[PDB]
Design a binder for these strands. Structure first.
Lengths: 78, 47
RNA sequence: CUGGUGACUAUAGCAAGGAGGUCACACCUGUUCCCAUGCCGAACACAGAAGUUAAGCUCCUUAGCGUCGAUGGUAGUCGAACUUACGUUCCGCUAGAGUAGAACGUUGCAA
RNA sequence: UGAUAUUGAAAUUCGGCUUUCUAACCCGCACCACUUAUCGUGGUGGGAGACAGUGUCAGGCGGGCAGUUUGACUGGGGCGGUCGCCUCCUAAAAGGUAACGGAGGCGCUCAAAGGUUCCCUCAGAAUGGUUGGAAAUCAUUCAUAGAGUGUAAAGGCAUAAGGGAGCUUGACUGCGAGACCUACAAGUCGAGCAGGGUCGAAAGACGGACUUAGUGAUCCGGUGGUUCCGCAUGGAAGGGCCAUCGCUCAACGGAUAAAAGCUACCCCGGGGAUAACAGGCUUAUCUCCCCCAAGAGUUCACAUCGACGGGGAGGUUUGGCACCUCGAUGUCGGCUCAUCGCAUCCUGGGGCUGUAGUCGGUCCCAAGGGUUGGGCUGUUCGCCCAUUAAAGCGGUA
RNA sequence: GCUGGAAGGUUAAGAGGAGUGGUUAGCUUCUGCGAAGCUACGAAUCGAAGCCCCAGUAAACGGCGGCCGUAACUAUAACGG
RNA sequence: GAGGGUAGCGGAGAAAUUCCAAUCGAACCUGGAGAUAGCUGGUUCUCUCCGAAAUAGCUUUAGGGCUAGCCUCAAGUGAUGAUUAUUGGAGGUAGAGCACUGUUUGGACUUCAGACAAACUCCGAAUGCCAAUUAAUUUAACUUGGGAGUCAGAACAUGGGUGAUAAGGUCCGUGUUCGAAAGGGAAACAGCCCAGACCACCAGCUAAGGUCCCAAAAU
RNA sequence: AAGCAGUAAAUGUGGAGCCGUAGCGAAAGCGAGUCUGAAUAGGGCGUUUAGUAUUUGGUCGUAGACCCGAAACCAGGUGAU
């Protein structure tokens, strides 16, 4: 009697990296994901692995994109 | 089968690249137009 | 008030009944020219006499499907005590029912 | 076993194979002398002879002998299985999270399956036709995804990331503010600046592929380039820097360039951190006791028997776990018949009967006393012989 | 394993030195040739045994099988696939 | 019987690992030598202050080690630490449900009723988590240097896997106590309830738990 | 420092040598700046620019290195009463 299972891969630490209402630097990472669960908003871009990152210095806000969708944006408030 | 090759600049200063190729589909040496570092322009790369 | 372009989770939708036209929109004839078809002026692109509400688009009604949606109660649960399944105190579903609901609103050409 | 030194003289044949000869070298061969000795030496006759023996260099055989290696995890060890990477669940709505827990993949492919610019919308169903499923091509209506997306799964994608055409090679060079992850070594994302470019009318997009797997430190060695060094000077050997190649080093952070077994002839240092005997916890298994009553029983569920299903007690079995004991708790059967429990084998007292009587069956009370001798087998167990009122079942390491 | 054989293949040291590189007396491109010496490598050719091969040997080491039918043997197969 | 021979990388053996000075799977003595021992045992006077861990990664690694986490001392910055109130956000568990993917019962003839799900979702909490430069209370936090120990954990409650909804079983998440904690209660009883011992007193009030006698307080 | 003089002293004398005052780069090299790079363009390491000699305490390294304890290995000898 033996087992065929036992295998798993190293866990990838996905999820949100910055909080709503916080000030971030020029190129801070905001969200790690597979696919598009959250869309890039104002002043926010997508990386090659779907990573969302900021492109200015400002405060970050999570928003709503119509229905069943949502987006995150950065605003340059000083 | 899959094999790796090197592209060398033709009739000019050599600026080398590395890539892969399927030997069945491309039995002959491939040719491309790549940038030459020490000639500061695109040239023809053979092999 | 007809048309152009933007913002709002269908409370904007789908479906049925009805009104209308050469200002605008639109159906319509044709392939000489710029353009085009796995083949086909259907589409795309052009030259435009006339012709039609028949069709798209906007207008009034419509709770027939879709969407929205309280109150009260219930399930679950933070914490506290007893004990092993029961008190007390906050928070508070889902489903269902009473209900909205035939959209509100920005900038300019005219009208 | 071959070459070469000791090793010399002549002469046939395509400096060499091959034949004679004697002087080197050899004789545990005979005779003489030292010498009353035949160890040794010398002389003289015979035998052999450039061979053999010996030195240096080379190839082969070689458990006869020697030095060593022969992995880890593990509900004890051995046997079986697994070891690095990717995706989902257990995972308790941030991240992280174990088990020899439940399921699958990878050690690649693509010269267009890459970049850019335009255009398009799938699967499935009915209707009518050379009728192979009206689904092998055809034209309608219905259809928000059930279609496809190289390859597992998850998350995304109809703005399409899906389908089709034109051009092309950014599957470029030097870099890089900032940030995620993290013991280290590594891994991941990245706006912008400069030099070349492709597509597009232009704004713009392009540092491979919808995303996540397709990989291996250092030392050493090879191939190209180069404002470097080069031991008195000038060169050159030999190094340094840049680019790149060679490991199923898969036990995948990789002991070395190179490695398997037996020990009952065994030894030492430790451990109840870990098994075998007994104790302890549990009761799957075991042994007893009940609930329901389809039925059997000449009719008649319950005198007796009790299918399919359900609920308990005990701690005498085989097991599970690993809490004391490895600076030692002696392991089976027998002799002994001591002491205790009652779920009673005989005796004592009763209810029911499918109890005429003599025997029986089943249930209740009761532990006072009693409960044989032999054959076979180391046996416990078991079969048999002859008796008895009866030849009871269990605990006490 | 042992013994015998040599038709071919593989096979060391040792012999042989076709070519190549380093240096420089002389030339001129004005950073390319280059004789004589010394010096770092050298390949075709010759080279024994062994092994690959051929044969014998078991009182040498060792080895001595399966499925399926069939009466003048009722069950069974003498005999056959 | 006497006199002799064979010596340890050896000798002898009618064969047993048998014998070679009461010792032999390789005799005794003296040297290398204080061999090596990731393994047991031990390590000597007194007060004061602070005070752990039994985890992760890699390992010829598993009762060993190295880096990180947790303790202490000295210097520096200094509000950057903690709790609560308000507002904002990311993330699909409990529950529920059948719109997807599978499973399922009874009626019709695609539809109406009724159920199930870790790897199902049209939905969706309580808690926990990240922030502000927003108030009140409190006392920590970060950086650079010197010195460590730790890598065998246990029980209770609760959320789960495994086992048989067995084990004082085993493997993870979340709190407490023991470890390293004396005192009171539970008869006795490290882990359960109450509660943290600087010293002295023949003073007072309480907690858990109790008040007929042992045994302090209601027959 | 060795040495020399001095009572086996104290300390005279002795300036070979050592650390610091300037870094960066593999090196040639340049220098408050250097390396990479076509380019301070960007980036890395420097421009703090106060050390140095003796000594108390803590820890480390080389020597047996806190103490006691093997089963074994090698070398030279003694033994057949």
């Amino acid at each position: 009697s033996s087992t065929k299972n036992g295998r798993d891969s190293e866990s990838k630490r996905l999820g949100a990296k910055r909080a709503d209402g916080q000030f971030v630097t020029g190129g801070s990472i905001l969200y790690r994901q597979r696919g598009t669960k959250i869309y890039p908003g104002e002043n926010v871009g997508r990386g090659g692995d779907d990573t969302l990152f900021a492109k200015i210095d400002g405060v970050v806000k999570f928003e709503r994109k119509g229905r069943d969708k949502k987006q995150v944006s950065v605003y340059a408030v000083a | 089968m899959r094999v790796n090759v090197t592209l060398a600049c033709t009739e000019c200063g050599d600026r080398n690249y590395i890539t892969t190729k399927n030997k069945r589909n491309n039995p002959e040496r491939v040719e491309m137009k790549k940038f030459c570092s020490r000639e500061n322009k695109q040239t023809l790369h053979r092999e």
